């Protein structure tokens, strides 16, 4: 199939499109979709007494991924930041003091790449690196 | 060639519940939300909340405190809203409605009605 | 909760005259460059018909002589010549946050 694409066997060609947040925790995204087209955009806002850290806006590329980085309404007390919910993923934790972990695992039928665990570092850092949901095709 | 097809007309006591299917065809189904809808006959029109059928994740309206549950079954392109605790004020005409890429609800079940009465 | 107001509740027009009917939103429905407010045609015994989104675009298959406009807050779908199938309620609605809410609707019939 051309760009932006996708078969149905693994060769009809169906749109592309990007995951929907499973969940945005203390904040909202429009518009609320139940998946994005390529090209299309979804906006973050924060509620009152939380820093919006990320990309605010982010716009779905034709191999179903998202630009810029993932977005977060994090209040700030805590050791490490909040590490955020990548587009496709669920995370395990609430809680980011020193030591404590967060798991990942990507729902619906996405590939997870990254790290599906991390730890909240001494230094005020997370361990690994950020897992990433891809679509099964591309 | 997108068609929402519900299921038929119910009527319940009140603090009975009520479970309305809505099947889905001509789209790929995990592609939106399905969104549901009610208006009490000659009212407005009342949005209850959503579920994603990628996840199960769902939404809803606050002042339904709860007593709303969405469900999908994706193997056969339907979802499933559920109200319980139902009262005389709960008796409406409700709707499946999905999203188009503008958030707009661009398709719309029949509707099915539900009267709540003793 | 962002409450959408209509007005008028209900309004007669004469066949071929324009029918105009506004929606005030208590808050702002407008983001990311885009006014996220549609207006959707109700007749009875049917659900709702999508006819305006994002404000100002026609749905396809929608005829032209309607159209929509307004920003922010303030809204209008105009018709600018009422045919006997026109005759229906009008309703509101956006799409800013949730939850998703509609105006009361706007009753539109045909003026003698």
């Known amino acids: 199939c051309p760009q932006g694409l996708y078969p149905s066997p693994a060769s009809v060609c169906k749109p592309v499109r990007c995951p929907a947040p499973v969940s945005f925790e203390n904040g909202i995204y429009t518009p609320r979709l139940g998946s994005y087209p390529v090209g299309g955009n979804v906006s973050f806002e924060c509620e009152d007494g939380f820093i919006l850290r990320g990309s605010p806006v982010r716009q779905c590329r034709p191999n179903g991924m998202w630009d810029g980085e993932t977005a977060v309404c994090d209040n700030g007390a805590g050791h490490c930041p909040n590490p955020g919910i990548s587009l496709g993923a669920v995370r395990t934790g609430f809680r980011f003091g020193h030591g404590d972990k967060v798991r990942y695992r990507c729902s619906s039928n996405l590939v997870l790449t990254g790290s599906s665990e991390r730890e909240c570092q001494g230094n005020g850092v997370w361990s690994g690196t950020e897992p990433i949901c891809r679509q099964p095709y591309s | 060639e997108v068609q929402l097809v519900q299921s038929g007309a119910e009527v319940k006591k009140p603090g009975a519940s009520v479970k309305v299917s809505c099947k889905a065809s001509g789209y790929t189904f995990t592609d939106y939300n399905m969104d549901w809808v009610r208006q009490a006959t000659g009212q407005g029109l009342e949005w209850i909340g959503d579920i994603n059928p990628n996840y199960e994740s769902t939404g809803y309206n606050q002042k339904f405190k709860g007593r709303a549950t969405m469900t999908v079954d994706k193997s056969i392109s339907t979802a499933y809203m559920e109200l319980s605790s139902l009262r005389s004020e709960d008796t409406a005409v409700y709707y499946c409605?999905?999203?188009?890429?503008?958030?707009?609800?661009?398709?719309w079940g029949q509707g099915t009605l539900v009267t709540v009465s003793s | 909760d962002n409450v959408l107001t209509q007005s008028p509740d209900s309004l007669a027009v004469s066949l071929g005259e324009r029918a105009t009917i506004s929606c005030r939103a208590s808050?702002?429905?407008?983001?990311?460059?885009?006014?996220?407010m549609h207006w959707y045609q109700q007749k009875p015994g049917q659900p709702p018909k999508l006819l305006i989104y994002l404000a100002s675009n026609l749905k396809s298959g929608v005829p032209d002589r309607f159209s929509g406009s307004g920003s922010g807050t303030d809204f209008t779908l105009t018709i600018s010549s009422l045919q006997a199938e026109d005759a229906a309620t009008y309703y509101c609605?956006?799409?800013?946050?949730?939850?998703?809410?509609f105006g009361q609707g706007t009753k539109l019939e045909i003026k003698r």
């Open positions: 409605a999905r999203e188009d890429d503008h958030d707009a609800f661009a398709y």
């Open positions: 609605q956006h799409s800013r946050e949730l939850p998703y809410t």
């Open positions: 808050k702002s429905v407008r983001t990311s460059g885009y006014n996220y």
